[PDB]
Design a protein around this ligand. Structure first.
Ligand SMILES: Nc1ncnc2c1ncn2[C@@H]1O[C@H](COP(=O)(O)OP(N)(=O)O)[C@@H](O)[C@H]1O
Ligand SMILES: [Cl-]
Ligand SMILES: [Cl-]
Length: 386
């Protein structure tokens, strides 16, 4: 009977439930409404979510993330060759051509397929919902990017089955975000919807059309390597150079642990800058026992990221061109992904659409799970959201 909606994200995952026409996004054990898509293996335990992300800098080799970049892919694919430079964990090709993620767990070498790693994240989201409901959950709707091919969709479904979920349906992330805002119901005539999704690792722009409760993905574009982690890297690179000028040319980038600790504080300051004009980046005993401290204004962060922020409009122009439509024909602009909280990004999109206010009432990192939860309730026979 009970069906949940799960956004299985590249960096963060989110679970929601739609009951009595309303959607609850469920907080995990730490009170977090989203959970890192991380799995770590130690000498004693298997950690998932917050606990896995929290010890990533201390156990880089055995902390797995980005399994969504590998799911349903052949190891020989050029995207795997390119992405693997970003991973401290080992990935090798099996005899069937499938990627095998290699870690040490309890002093033993273990290998996992990407869908096994994703099944552990899905199982954690299932348990987050179960703790909240006080009852077992079997049914789920899971979302995937619109560009996911048959192999990536099937492997995501398999990850659900391994997690103990009966996958009612795999639906597109941009469509789930549009469903969250009731744009399928409120719009009787044709509606052109632009989904602007900027997360932690990827940027997806999708142009949808909705005529008579039916959504069609007309055009998609974006950048699979543009997200919040790239804005954090702009702050990291600046701090590395700032440390050099302060401490006689000493180079923090030569120590990978120093970089990881600096990156963690850079991402925190970045979040603060979405609601304050300034933030402090502080790392005690960063490199060579030297303490590091710097103040970053929102203007300086905007300057370091200026080109990356402005270039988010290029895939917007591309989808409009592919769909053969003018920006004036877009009825709604939906902001999805945690990076859409950046004020400069919101301003750039608004100005591009000639002052049109984007739909951002739903927490942008929750809108996909929210829509998946609505769809899961509908597929279970509950018409209360409609
Ligand atoms: N307040 C905030 N301002 C700027 N960036 C923010 C933010 N809150 C979250 N983020 C960013 O959102 C990214 C994760 O977005 P999310 O939509 O949850 O993840 P995902 N798996 O879909 O990529 C991270 O880079 C994080 O720093
Ligand atoms: Cl339900
Ligand atoms: Cl409840």
């Amino acid at each position: 009977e009970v069906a949940i909606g799960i956004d299985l994200g590249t960096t963060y995952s989110c679970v929601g439930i739609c009951r009595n026409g309303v959607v609850d996004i469920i907080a995990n054990d730490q009170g977090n409404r989203t959970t890192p898509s991380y799995v770590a293996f130690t000498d004693t335990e298997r950690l998932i979510g917050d606990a896995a992300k929290n010890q990533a800098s201390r156990n880089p080799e055995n902390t797995v993330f980005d399994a969504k970049r590998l799911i349903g892919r052949k190891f020989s694919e050029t995207t795997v060759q390119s992405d693997m430079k970003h991973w401290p964990f080992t990935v090798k090709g099996g005899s069937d051509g499938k990627p095998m993620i290699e870690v040490s767990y309890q002093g033993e070498k273990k290998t996992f397929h990407p869908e096994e790693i994703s099944s552990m994240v899905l199982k954690k989201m299932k348990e987050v919902a179960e703790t909240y409901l006080g009852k077992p959950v079997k049914n789920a709707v899971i979302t995937v990017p619109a560009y996911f091919n048959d192999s990536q969709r099937q492997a995501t479904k398999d990850a659900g089955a391994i997690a103990g979920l009966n996958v009612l349906r795999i639906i597109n992330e941009p469509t789930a975000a549009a469903i969250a805002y009731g744009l399928d119901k409120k719009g009787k005539g044709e509606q052109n919807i632009l989904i602007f999704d900027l997360g932690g690792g990827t940027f997806d722009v999708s142009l949808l059309t909705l005529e008579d409760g039916i959504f069609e993905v007309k055009a998609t574009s974006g950048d699979t390597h543009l997200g919040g982690e790239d804005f954090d890297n702009k702050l990291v690179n600046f701090c590395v150079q700032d440390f050099k000028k302060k401490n006689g040319g000493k180079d923090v980038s030569k120590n990978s642990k120093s970089l990881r600790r600096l990156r963690t504080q850079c991402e925190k300051a970045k979040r603060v800058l979405s609601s304050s004009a300034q933030a402090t980046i502080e790392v005690d005993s960063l490199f060579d026992g030297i303490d590091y401290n710097v103040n970053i204004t929102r203007a300086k962060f905007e300057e370091l990221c200026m080109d990356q922020f402005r270039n988010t409009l290029i895939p917007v122009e591309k989808v409009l061109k592919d769909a053969k439509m003018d920006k004036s024909q877009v009825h709604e602009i939906v902001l999805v992904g945690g990076s859409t909280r950046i004020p400069k990004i919101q301003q750039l999109i608004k100005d591009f659409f000639n002052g049109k206010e984007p739909c951002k009432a739903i927490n942008p990192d929750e809108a996909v799970a929210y829509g998946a939860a609505v769809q899961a309730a509908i597929l279970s026979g509950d018409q209360s959201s409609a």
